[PDB]
Write a protein that binds this DNA or RNA. Sequence first.
DNA 1: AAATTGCCGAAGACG
DNA 2: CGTCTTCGGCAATT
Length: 354
Amino acid sequence: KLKKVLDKLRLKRKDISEAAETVNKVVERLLRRMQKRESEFKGVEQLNTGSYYEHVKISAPNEFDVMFKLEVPRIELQEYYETGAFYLVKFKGNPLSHFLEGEVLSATKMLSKFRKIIKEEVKEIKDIDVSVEKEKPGSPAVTLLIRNPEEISVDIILALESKGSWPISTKEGLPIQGWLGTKVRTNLRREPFYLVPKNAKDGNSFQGETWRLSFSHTEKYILNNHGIEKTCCESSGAKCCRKECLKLMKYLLEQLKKEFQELDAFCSYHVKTAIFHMWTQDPQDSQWDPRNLSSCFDKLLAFFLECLRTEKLDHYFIPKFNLFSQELIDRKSKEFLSKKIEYERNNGFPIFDK
DNA sequence: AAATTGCCGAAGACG
DNA sequence: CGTCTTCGGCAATT
Ligand SMILES: Nc1nc2c(ncn2[C@@H]2O[C@H](COP(=O)(O)O[C@@H]3C[C@@H](COP(=O)(O)OP(=O)(O)OP(=O)(O)O)O[C@H]3n3cnc4c(=O)[nH]c(N)nc43)C[C@H]2O)c(=O)[nH]1
Ligand SMILES: [Mg+2]
Ligand SMILES: [Mg+2]
Ligand SMILES: [Zn+2]
């Protein structure tokens, strides 16, 4: 049965071809625009991210994530309160000076200009039906809506790229030592880290100047290199069911979110974070044999439910950042989700049949 | 130095 | 399952 669900979740190449062709055209055009000329974003480079490029996108290739990353040398980070994830950016006749607010590089000012330029360029596109979605307060994304004629959304994410050592709140994160190993962990942590203009929610409003850490590049690597054995899922190695379990859990949540508005606070990143923890807890590829899909999915569900119950789901890269804090998600919402998941779990997952 | 190019891994399609 | 294919990511090389 789970196999049948995975078959239906599996993307079709025809859909992939048609969607990628249009998405690539639109993005290539926006990127070229940024790169020329007298703009503060001139040196941005593209990094494709999220579920489509990690091969865990489900049902249809109808949502694409892409970062336009700007390398910003000599930036100084000040942790926003003790959040671990959120930062004020300051510096040691540059283009980003327009976005200053004191010594502080305002995420909001910079994102607003970035968004302005995207919109202007989108207006110039005549051969493709593309519009930009209304702004969502606090979000780092400029979201495009493409009609291909089928609906495809594309999040363009501005990011700052810093080549320095990662902020200390990440020091005991990425606990992959017994799974992917020490060389991998050390090498990953020598790569750049990113900041996206997602504002910290502070009480009733957002702090407009704040940025949030992003490890999209590291996560992409992990998804593509996820076995304790180097040949995991390769042509001369054994297939595991790690990604299949992730797809099923994402589907379960998507389906539940579709019919209950009280689940608005939950997102796929919660599921992705949960399974990162599970892959740490069960590092052996033998624990993710396709023959044991049902059992791996069940263990993931059990862990997720325990996260809910204990109101604790630590960010995988930033252990003191609790995604399931009361500040972020009300206890009642988490109890609501537990009930719905337990029900589906206890009754053969009827929601999988649409 | 911006743009093209092939290489080959991941995984869909098909029998 | 094996073989075929397309798309993405890389970086040399123009
Ligand atoms: N590259 C990137 N993009 C980030 C990001 N953080 C947020 N984004 C982009 O912003 C929008 C909205 O952000 P959000 O915080 O308000 O809500 C995100 C949305 C979902 C997952 O979105 P996704 O990026 O598209 O993930 P997929 O892996 O592609 O999965 P699908 O469901 O299959 O698409 O989760 C929320 N969320 C909460 N916390 C998040 C986080 O820390 N990182 C991410 N990526 N999402 C997070 C979403 C996205 O386009 C970031 O760090 N890097
Ligand atoms: Mg996505
Ligand atoms: Mg998205
Ligand atoms: Zn694998």
